[PDB]
């Protein structure tokens, strides 16, 4: 039963370096899912959201990150946006289940969290599931620069700001994607 270190973990990583954990050789319970309902979004593609413990797959790959509440719709097949074209892009034939719930009593601090970075500019769109951890300068302008971070030389990882005194559009949602495969 390896669904106990994926959801209730201490600190998820950022959205750009989205952590992965492999699940194998144990049929999961799916008891906290679709029977506890403390989560916000359960937008679950392909397979029915109610029949999970009956079915069996080949590989169960889980991954996780933390995104703003106005960007919870971007974790989707092909729905373009800001994080779904530079940080983490699902493919168009992805089957699996997407999980999201609120996290403001854990991930927010008075004065900004300043440690949940997200990637702003990249030279092209992302491929499906391709992740990049490098912090190379985008150099939007004509000139190249040697990491000097000047005019049109950005740090591509913009830092989130997280305070408990905000709305729902600016609150970090702990979002975990489940990816399954048949053969």
């Amino acid at each position, epitope marked *: 039963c390896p669904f106990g270190e994926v959801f209730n973990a201490t600190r998820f*990583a950022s959205v750009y*370096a989205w*952590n*992965r*954990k*492999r699940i*194998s050789n144990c049929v999961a319970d799916y008891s906290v899912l679709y029977n506890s309902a403390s989560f916000s979004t359960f937008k679950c593609y392909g397979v029915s959201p109610t029949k999970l413990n009956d079915l069996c797959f080949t*590989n169960v*790959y889980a991954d996780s990150f933390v995104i703003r509440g106005d960007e919870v719709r971007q974790i989707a097949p092909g729905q373009t946006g800001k994080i779904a074209d530079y940080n983490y892009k699902l*493919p168009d034939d992805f089957t699996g289940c997407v999980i999201a719930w609120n996290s403001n009593n854990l991930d927010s601090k008075v004065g900004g969290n300043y440690n949940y970075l997200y990637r702003l500019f990249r030279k*092209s769109n992302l*491929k*499906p*599931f*391709e*992740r*990049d*951890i*490098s912090t190379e300068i985008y150099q939007a302008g004509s000139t190249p620069c040697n990491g000097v971070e000047g005019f049109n030389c950005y740090f591509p990882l913009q830092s989130y700001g997280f305070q408990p005194t905000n709305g729902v559009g600016y609150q970090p949602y702990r979002v975990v994607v489940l*990816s399954f*495969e048949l053969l």
Partner: antibody
Amino acid sequence: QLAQSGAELARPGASVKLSCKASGYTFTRYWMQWVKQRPGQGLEWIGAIYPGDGDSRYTQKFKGKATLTADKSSSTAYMQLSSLASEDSAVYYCARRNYYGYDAFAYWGQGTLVTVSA
Amino acid sequence: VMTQSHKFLSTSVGDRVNITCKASQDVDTAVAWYQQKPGQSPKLLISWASTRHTGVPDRFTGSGSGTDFTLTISNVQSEDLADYFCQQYSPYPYTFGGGTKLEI
């Protein structure tokens, strides 16, 4: 599910077009990834391509030297050595990750002896 | 980047042997372990150091996390006598660890 490759004995000034014929999966969506192995001194990573689009990635000690290409229609990938020498006489594999993106090199092909002393 | 412990490794048959890889920077549990019989091509044995691969016996248990990874081969038979590898998957390039050859 398995890779297939070729063999080579070449000259110290020439250029080599190796191969890695892929089979059994969707060649448009996975990454092909090339590693090299000298006798001893462990493995080493060279570069990769995305045969759907042509978005090649490299290592700074191996950029410019290997010019990786791919062809969608023939379902194979080509690497192209340049300025070979005595240090490049090694074994060159190709490997596809298990689940595309950020995973483990789960399918490896047979070795291609490339012997380029003289 | 990686490094290895022993370039050569001597064991008897029934003995338990740990092979350790210490990574220089931090890798949040994304290494893998390869064996390589001296003829053929190296195959995947352990990936995401806790998890094993298909076609592999339950003898091979890799463990550890953070930046110290360990492979405890329990009862080394006459078959499992080859070198061993390491990896990293997060930063480019995916630079390998050195070899570590197992022998009697």
